[PDB]
Write a protein that binds this DNA or RNA. Structure first.
Lengths: 155, 105, 49, 43, 76
RNA sequence: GAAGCCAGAGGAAACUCUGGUGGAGGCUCGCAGCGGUUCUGACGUGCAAAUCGAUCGUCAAAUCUGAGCAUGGGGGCGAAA
RNA sequence: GGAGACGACGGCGGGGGCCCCGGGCAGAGUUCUCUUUUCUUCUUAACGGUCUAUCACCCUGGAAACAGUUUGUCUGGAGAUAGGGUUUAAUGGCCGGAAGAGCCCGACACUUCUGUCGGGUCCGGUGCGCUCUCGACGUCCCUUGAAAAUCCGCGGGAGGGAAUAAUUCUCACGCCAGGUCGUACUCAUAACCGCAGCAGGUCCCCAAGGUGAACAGCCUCUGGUUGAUAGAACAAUGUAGAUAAGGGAAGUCGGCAAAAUAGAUCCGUAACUUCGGGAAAAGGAUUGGCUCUAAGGGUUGGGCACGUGCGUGCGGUUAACAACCAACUUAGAACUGGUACGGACAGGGGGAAUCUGACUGUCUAAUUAAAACAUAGCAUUGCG
C-alpha cells in the first residue's frame, strides 16, 4: 500500500506541510481507497486524517533575558562585542538631544516664558553644544531670568 | 463593582464517583491566587457547591475562566484523570467535565 | 500673536466636533426620510408619470 | 513526551480504547459496572 | 460597489429598468439592516438602523423587483 | 574622519586655540559575490581533459553580472601575456 | 507646453508589511514540585465614496535689539516671522465591497449519498529593528546620467449654435463589441551544459526567532529532507582532526608547518613623512553572576470683565507645578563563584631594516600575479 498521493492531497487540503499530515496507520486500506480531494475531506471530517500541531518554539527565555537586561544585567565589558558607536551611535544621541532642546525652546517661546531674542541666542548655544540635556538648559534659562530680573531691579 | 459568575459542571463524573467535588472545592480554595498570593480570597472570590456535581465561583476581580480551566486540568493531572477527562467550555462561563470519545474494542 | 499648543489642540477638537455633528445630522436626515418613505415613493411615481 | 522534535497529538483527536479506560478506572477503584461504560463506548 | 445615503435616490435606483434583483442583509450584532440592489454596473447598498420603518421600506420598494433575505450561510 | 557649519576663549583685524557638528575618499577591517596567494595539502586510469580543503587578494569602485547588438582568419580583439 | 522621460551615493522624516510586548474569548500542551502558565486562530483584496496628510503657492502686513530654522546653515524688503487660506501627494482613518467570505471552537447526524445547527472572530502598546515605498534635503563629475509610440492641457477662433425651442455638454445612468498565440513540469548534488542521474558551471524575486556590531559562526520555528552500497573488526602505512614532561629552532637550503595574537572599555603610542599619514604602531590595565544607585524622555493642562463653546479688552511668566505614558543606552557601588569570565563560536602576532614598483587597478582560462602592463603627471612630433 502506497500513500504518497494521499499524503500530498491531505497536505493541500489541510493547508499544511506534508510533515504535519497524520494518516491513520490502522486504516491504510480505507485511506488508499481515497483518490480525490472530496474523499480526503471526508476522511479529515471522519478523523482518519488530522493535522499535527506545530513544534514548540517558546519565547519565555528571551522575555526573561529582556527583563534582566532592562533591570541592568548582562551589560558588562565582558558582554560588549561591538564598539560603543556600533551599540549606540553618537549621531543618534546628538539628534535626540538637539530635538529635545529645540522642542523645549519652542515650548518656552510659545508659552511666553522666554522672549524671541533669548530664544534665538539659546538656540545657537544649543547648536554650539553648550547644554548637556534639558535640565542644563532649564537651569541656564533660570539663571538668565535671575540676571535679567536683577538688572531690572538695579535699573 | 463588577461581578462575574463561573460554573464548573462535573456532574457526570461526580455521579460516576470518579471526580470528587468536595476535594476539587478544597483544591480551588487552596490554589486560587489573588494578587499573586494563594490563600488570599478574602471578600473577592467565593467558591461554593450549588449541588448536582457543580462548583460555583463568584469573582469581583478580573478572574478568568481560562485560569479556572488551568486549575481544573491541574486537579485532573493530580487525580490521574487528565488522559480520560476533558474540560470543555459549553456556555459563557460554563466549563463541563466529560469523557473523551471512547471506542469499543 | 503666535498661538500656543493648547490653542492649536482646541482648534483641532473643534474641527473634530464639527465633523461629528455633521455626521449625526446626516444620519438624522436619512432617518427622517425613512419615516417619510411612502410619500417619497409617491412623488417618484408621480414624476415618472 | 518528545517535545523537542514534535508536538504531542491532542487527546481529543485519538479515540481512547474502552478496555484501557475500564482498566484505569478499575485501578483507581471505581466500580465501572454500576455506571455502564459499555453503553457509553461508540462503535 | 456604491453606498446610497438618500432614500429617494434608493427608490429611483430600485425603479430603474436594469435593477435585476435586491437582497436584505441583517446584522443584529451592530443592529443594522442593509438593502442591496443589483444593477448593471454597480451594486448599491443603503445602510439603515434595524427598525420597523426599515422593515416597511420593503413595501415601498417596487413589487416587480425580486427581493430576497440573505441566509446565514452562503452555500455554493 | 576631508570640506562646509555652530559655540566658547583670544587677537585692531587677518587669523589662532578648544569643544562639537558634518560625513568626503579609485581610504580601511570584514560577510555575500568576484578572484586565485600559499601548502613536501587531497586527488593523479580523479567527483573533475584543471575538481576538493584550508589559507589568501578585493569588497562602493578602473566592482560583479544578464539579455540585445557590433568586430571574422592576409582578419578581429588585446591595461601587450 | 506638459507627461511618457530617466545617474550614483549619504543621512533624515512619513506609510504598508514583518518582527516584538500587554489584555481578552476559544482550543492544545506541561503539571513530583513550580508555572493566573507555554503555544495556536483573532484576517479584510481590487474598485469606489468621504475626511485628512511634507513641498509649494495665495492674502494681510512690513522685519536690526535681525529673525525663522535642519541631525546636516539655509531662508527672508525679489517681502521673512506671525496669523489666515489654496493645493501635488495614501500603501492613513471611516464607510460601501463585507461577513454572506476565510479562520477558530463546540453539539448532533452519518453504510455511503451526504452534512446540519450553534458560539466567536475583540481591545491596545512599542522602535537608531528588518524590508519595500514615498518625500524634502545634500554630495560627486574635464562623467551631467535614452528614444519613440501614446495621452493631456493651453494659445487661436474656424465652424456650429435657442425659444417651430435648441444643444456638436470631456456629467450621471443605460445599449453593443473585444480575434490570434504561449500557459503542464524542472530550473538543478537526477528534468540545462559538461559523452552520465558528473562534488564543476549556469541570470533573478520573497527571507522568521536567539546570541551578537552584524543576511559572521552556532542553536531553533515554518517548509523540506533523512538521498547519496551495506555488515563486522580496529594490524601496519596513510588521509583528516588533536594532546604531550623538560629544553625552546639545537631541526631545515630556508621557522615550511604548527603554536602564539585576536572582540570590547580604558591608559598610552617612536622614527620617518608628500603633514594627509605612520597608528589597531609599540607597551600596559580590565571583562562572569547577582543586588542596587544615578543620568539621559513624550503627551496633556493656567486667571478675570463682558457678549455668548468661541470673540475681545486685560492681567502673568515658579507650569521651576501636577496627571498620565514610555524605551534603550551609559556611568558608579556593594555582594558573590572561580583552575577558565570576548569561558563555545567568532577573532591582528608584533618589531628593526634592505631591495623593489609611486599608489587603486590589469594579464599569460589549464605550470610563471611579478621590478611585467596600465595609470595620473611630464616631454616631443604632425595637422587650419
Amino acid at each position: 500500500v502506497n500513500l504518497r498521493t494521499q499524503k500530498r492531497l491531505a497536505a493541500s487540503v489541510l493547508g499544511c506541510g506534508e510533515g504535519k499530515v497524520w494518516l491513520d496507520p490502522n486504516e491504510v486500506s480505507e485511506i488508499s481507497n481515497a483518490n480525490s480531494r472530496q474523499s480526503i475531506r471526508k476522511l479529515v471530517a471522519d478523523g482518519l486524517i488530522i493535522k499535527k500541531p506545530v513544534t514548540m518554539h517558546s519565547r519565555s527565555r528571551a522575555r526573561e533575558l529582556n527583563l534582566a537586561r532592562r533591570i541592568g544585567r548582562h551589560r558588562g565589558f565582558g558582554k560588549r562585542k561591538g564598539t560603543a558607536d556600533a551599540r549606540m551611535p553618537q549621531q543618534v544621541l546628538w539628534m535626540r538631544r538637539q530635538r529635545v532642546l529645540r522642542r523645549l525652546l519652542v515650548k518656552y517661546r510659545a508659552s511666553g516664558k522666554i522672549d524671541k531674542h533669548l530664544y534665538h541666542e539659546l538656540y545657537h548655544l544649543a547648536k554650539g553644544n553648550t547644554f548637556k540635556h534639558k535640565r542644563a538648559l532649564v537651569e541656564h534659562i533660570h539663571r538668565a531670568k535671575a540676571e535679567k530680573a536683577r538688572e531690572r531691579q538695579i535699573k | 463593582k463588577v461581578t462575574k459568575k463561573f460554573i464548573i459542571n462535573a456532574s457526570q463524573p461526580a455521579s460516576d464517583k470518579i471526580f470528587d467535588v468536595s476535594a476539587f472545592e478544597k483544591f480551588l480554595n487552596e490554589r486560587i491566587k489573588v494578587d499573586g498570593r494563594v490563600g488570599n480570597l478574602g471578600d473577592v472570590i467565593k467558591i461554593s457547591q450549588i449541588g448536582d456535581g457543580k462548583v460555583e465561583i463568584i469573582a469581583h476581580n478580573d478572574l478568568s475562566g481560562r485560569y479556572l480551566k488551568y486549575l481544573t486540568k491541574k486537579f485532573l493531572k493530580k487525580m490521574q484523570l487528565r488522559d480520560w477527562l476533558r474540560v470543555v467550555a459549553t456556555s459563557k462561563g460554563v466549563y463541563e467535565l466529560k469523557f473523551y470519545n471512547i471506542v469499543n474494542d | 500673536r503666535r498661538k500656543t499648543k493648547a490653542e492649536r489642540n482646541r482648534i483641532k477638537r473643534r474641527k473634530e466636533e464639527e465633523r461629528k455633528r455633521k455626521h449625526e445630522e446626516a444620519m438624522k436626515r436619512k432617518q427622517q426620510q425613512l419615516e417619510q418613505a411612502k410619500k417619497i415613493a409617491a412623488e417618484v411615481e408621480e414624476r415618472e408619470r | 513526551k518528545s517535545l523537542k522534535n514534535r508536538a504531542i497529538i491532542p487527546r481529543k483527536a485519538v479515540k481512547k480504547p474502552l478496555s484501557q479506560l475500564e482498566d484505569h478506572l478499575d485501578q483507581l477503584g471505581v466500580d465501572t459496572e454500576a455506571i455502564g461504560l459499555r453503553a457509553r463506548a461508540q462503535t | 460597489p456604491q453606498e446610497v445615503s438618500d432614500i429617494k435616490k434608493f427608490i429611483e435606483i430600485c425603479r430603474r429598468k436594469d435593477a435585476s434583483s435586491a437582497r436584505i442583509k441583517k446584522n443584529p450584532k451592530t443592529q443594522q439592516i442593509k438593502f442591496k440592489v443589483r444593477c448593471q454596473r454597480f451594486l448599491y447598498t443603503l445602510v439603515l438602523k434595524d427598525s420597523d420603518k426599515a422593515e416597511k421600506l420593503k413595501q415601498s420598494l417596487p413589487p416587480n423587483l425580486q427581493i430576497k433575505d440573505v441566509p446565514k450561510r452562503n452555500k455554493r
